[PDB]
């Protein structure tokens, strides 16, 4: 056989029922949720999110998340999601919709899952295949090594293809990673992350930055740069494809004037 299929139609909701919520850090959680039955798989490509879909305050919120489970997983949907709370920031009092009411979940409460959705497909041993535009056809591109630039949860998209890479032991590609934060406490995953290292280093190539750092640090400082992305990514000679996912303005000040600086190309990058 093969596994049952949770998301069998794209327009379809599936209501999930969450069963595990864990701390990832002040602000960040990782949420379980039940697939319809414990022998189920999702049906998510490697790279692609769903959406969650709920009635908040009266209106209809939807909003994409990015799973860091895989199809290998029986029977649970893992989420890493950070809360956007109310009552803190001067600007965002009210804090953010789905978020919050993700925190207030009661375990058992149900939410609706759909997908999947997005441009990119890893299809393993090197292979990406990337539609231009969701109306045109995926292009298939292999390469031999892949840079990540990551700020805040745009980690989870990167963490997808890095367990797909390292789980398989014929895949060879190595994936540079360079993961910025606010402040070290801001950092997600660590450990996890730094399991990966241990576990791969040929592999996996692990740098950080953070906006503030603390006295004690061995990693970069400040916002994604020139710099960081020369030292933490492959060059551009080799070919790589860049992956970037994170805040609008890291993308749009930090990621693509620096990736032309160094000489990456467009056609070699994907922003998720
Ligand atoms: C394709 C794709 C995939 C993903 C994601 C985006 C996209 C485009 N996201 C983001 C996610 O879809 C969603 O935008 C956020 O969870 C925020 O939605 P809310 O409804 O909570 O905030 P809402 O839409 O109400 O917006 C409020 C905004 O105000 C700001 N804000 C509010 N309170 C704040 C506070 N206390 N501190 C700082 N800023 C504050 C934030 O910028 C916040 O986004 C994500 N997210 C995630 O956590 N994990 C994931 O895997 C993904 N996956
Ligand atoms: N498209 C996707 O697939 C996808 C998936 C997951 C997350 N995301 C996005 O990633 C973001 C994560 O937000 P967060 O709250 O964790 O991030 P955050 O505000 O904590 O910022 C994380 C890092 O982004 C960089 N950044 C932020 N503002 C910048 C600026 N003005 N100039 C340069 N760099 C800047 C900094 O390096 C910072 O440490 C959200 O916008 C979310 O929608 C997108």
Same mark, same amino acid.
Not at 37 to 64: K, M
Not at 144 to 168: E, N
Not at 246 to 255: K, R, S, V
């Given at each position: =056989?093969?596994?049952?299929?949770?998301?069998?139609?794209?327009? *379809?909701?599936?209501?999930?029922?969450?069963?595990?919520?864990?701390?990832?850090?002040?602000?960040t959680?990782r949420f379980?949720?039940? %697939?319809? =039955?414990?022998?189920? *798989?999702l049906?998510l490509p490697v790279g692609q999110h769903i959406y969650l =879909? @709920?009635?908040?305050?009266?209106? %209809?919120?939807?909003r994409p998340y990015t799973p860091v489970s895989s199809?290998?997983?029986?029977?649970?949907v893992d989420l890493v999601i950070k809360?956007?709370?109310?009552?803190? $920031?001067?600007?965002?009092? @009210?804090?953010?919709?789905?978020?919050?009411?993700?925190?207030?979940?009661?375990?058992?409460?149900?939410? &609706?899952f759909?997908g999947p959705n997005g441009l990119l497909v890893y !299809?393993?041993?090197?292979?990406?295949?990337?539609?231009?535009?969701?109306? =045109?056809?995926?292009?298939?591109?292999?390469?031999?090594?892949?840079?990540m630039?990551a700020?805040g949860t745009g980690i989870t998209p990167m963490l997808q293809v890095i367990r797909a *890479?390292?789980?398989?032991?014929?895949?060879?590609?190595?994936?540079?990673? +360079?993961?910025?934060?606010?402040?070290?406490?801001?950092?997600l995953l660590?450990? &996890?992350?730094? #399991? +990966?290292?241990?576990? $791969?280093?040929?592999?996996?190539? %692990?740098?950080?930055?953070?906006?503030?750092?603390?006295?004690?640090?061995?990693?970069? !400082?400040?916002?994604?740069?020139? &710099?960081?992305?020369?030292?933490?990514?492959?060059?551009?000679? &080799?070919?790589?494809?860049?992956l970037?996912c994170g805040?609008?303005?890291?993308?749009?000040?930090?990621?693509?004037?620096? %990736? #032309?600086?160094?000489?990456?190309?467009?056609?070699?990058?994907? @922003?998720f």
């Amino acid at each position: =056989s093969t596994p049952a299929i949770t998301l069998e139609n794209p327009d *379809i909701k599936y209501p999930l029922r969450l069963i595990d919520k864990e701390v990832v850090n002040h602000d960040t959680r990782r949420f379980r949720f039940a %697939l319809p =039955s414990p022998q189920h *798989i999702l049906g998510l490509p490697v790279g692609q999110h769903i959406y969650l =879909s @709920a009635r908040i305050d009266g209106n %209809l919120v939807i909003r994409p998340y990015t799973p860091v489970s895989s199809d290998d997983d029986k029977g649970f949907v893992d989420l890493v999601i950070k809360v956007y709370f109310k009552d803190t $920031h001067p600007k965002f009092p @009210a804090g953010g919709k789905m978020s919050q009411y993700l925190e207030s979940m009661k375990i058992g409460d149900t939410i &609706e899952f759909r997908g999947p959705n997005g441009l990119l497909v890893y !299809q393993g041993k090197g292979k990406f295949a990337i539609r231009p535009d969701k109306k =045109s056809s995926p292009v298939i591109k292999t390469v031999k090594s892949v840079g990540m630039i990551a700020g805040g949860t745009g980690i989870t998209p990167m963490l997808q293809v890095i367990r797909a *890479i390292m789980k398989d032991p014929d895949d060879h590609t190595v994936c540079h990673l +360079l993961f910025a934060n606010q402040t070290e406490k801001d950092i997600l995953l660590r450990p &996890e992350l730094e #399991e +990966l290292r241990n576990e $791969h280093s040929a592999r996996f190539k %692990l740098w950080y930055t953070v906006d503030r750092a603390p006295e004690a640090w061995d990693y970069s !400082q400040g916002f994604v740069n020139e &710099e960081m992305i020369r030292d933490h990514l492959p060059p551009p000679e &080799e070919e790589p494809l860049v992956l970037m996912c994170g805040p609008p303005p890291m993308i749009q000040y930090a990621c693509l004037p620096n %990736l #032309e600086r160094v000489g990456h190309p467009k056609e070699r990058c994907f @922003a998720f």
